[PDB]
C-alpha cells in the first residue's frame, strides 16, 4: 500500500566556494536583426545600437 512501496530518492546536493562557477542553466537566444536600433546582448555584452 501507499507509504510501504519502494521509492527512488535522488538528492541534488551542491556546494560553493570550491572552484570557479562552471555549471549554469540553459541560456535562451533570440533571432538576429539588422539595420534597426535594438538592445543586443552578446555573451553578456549588453548595449544598444
Amino acid at each position: 500500500g501507499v507509504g510501504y512501496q519502494p521509492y527512488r530518492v535522488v538528492v541534488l546536493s551542491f556546494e560553493l566556494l570550491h572552484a570557479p562557477a562552471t555549471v549554469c542553466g540553459p541560456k535562451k537566444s533570440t533571432n538576429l536583426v539588422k539595420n534597426k536600433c535594438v538592445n543586443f546582448n552578446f555573451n553578456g555584452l549588453t548595449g544598444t545600437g
Binding site: 570550491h18 572552484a19 570557479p20 562552471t22
Partner: protein
C-alpha cells in the same frame, strides 16, 4: 612559428594566440615538464 636556424633563439616578432582556456580553479606553486627520453 617556423624558423630557419637551428641555433639559439632567433631575431623576429610573432604574437601568440590563445589555444586552451580552462576553469581549473586550483592551487599552483610548482610546475614540471615531461620527457619521453644504458648509460654506457
Amino acid at each position: 612559428t617556423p624558423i630557419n636556424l637551428v641555433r639559439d633563439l632567433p631575431q623576429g616578432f610573432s604574437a601568440l594566440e590563445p589555444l586552451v582556456d580552462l576553469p581549473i580553479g586550483i592551487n599552483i606553486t610548482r610546475f614540471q615538464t615531461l620527457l619521453a627520453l644504458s648509460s654506457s
